[model samples]
Target chain A: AVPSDSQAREKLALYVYEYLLHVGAQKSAQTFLSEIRWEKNITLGEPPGFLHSWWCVFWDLYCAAP
Target chain B: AVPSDSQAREKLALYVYEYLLHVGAQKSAQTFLSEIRWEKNITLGEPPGFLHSWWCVFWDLYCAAP
Candidate 1:
């Protein structure tokens, strides 16, 4: 059976955390939580697999918002 | 262990280098590269990941050409 919480999710979460850290977020529990929110909800129509498309959405949001 | 020299293969290396030194080269590079190498290739085979199904084969050849 396929793992519900697969390695992709873990890897994506770690990637988001690394990005947040790179942007100078404090390396704390809250940082992990914040990144988790983005990582878990990055895509609209899929789980943690459509990372590249989700990144485009994230980039557009980030660029347009700030 | 699976580093098949396959992290997108730096298809835009020459354009990037030339564009870096000359502002005018930017538009030209964009136009040429946009026309030639605008697709994804990860979808052709049963790859181990979520393939995007786009690959710039012509662009790869163009870049590899002398």
Candidate 2:
């Protein structure tokens, strides 16, 4: 059941952005993504450290899909 | 209270960046700030549309911070 919560969607957006960084996108991309995500949702999880990790792996491949 | 919330700190970092943009700094600076902020925290406010509003205030003070 996909909730249409705007904030959740915004977090998802940030999640995608973080995912990109994990894959080696320029550091700047991560920043811009966070800015956009903040606009949509000001309250989400902490930023991920060590861009490449198990959580990111799960999110990038599975949780990302709509 | 020390709000060690990484997400909040990340937002504060973005605020500093947006503040820089508002003062007539280059777009690149704003972008760079966002990236650093993201690494620390992903959830924060959206990118400030009027960089000038924040930048001018911050730059003037930052230049005199020392």
- For candidate 1, lDDT tens digit of each residue in B1-66? 775755455434433434433544556656655665745431222332122112243334334422
In model 1, state the lDDT of residue B8: 51
| Deviation (Å) of A34 in candidate 2 | 9.0
TM-scores of chain A in all candidate models: 0.39, 0.39
TM of each candidate vs. truth: 0.28, 0.24
lDDT of 2 by residue, B1-66 (tens): 766696666655666565656556768655786566455442334555434555565455445421
Top model number, lDDT = 2
**Model 2 ranges with Cα > 4 A deviation:** A1-3, A27-66, B1-66
Best-fitting candidate, scored by DockQ: 1
Error at A41, model 1, angstroms: 23
Q: Single out the weakest 10-residue window by summed lDDT for candidate 1 chain B.
A: B44-53
What is the per-residue lDDT of model 2 for residues A1-66, given as tens digits with 9 covering 90 to 100?
766696666555666666666557757655776566454443334545333454555444443332
Quality class of the docking in candidate 1, CAPRI style = incorrect
Which pairs, if any, clash in model 2? A39-B46, B19-B55, B22-B51, B22-B52, B22-B55, B23-B55
lDDT of 1 at A3: 95
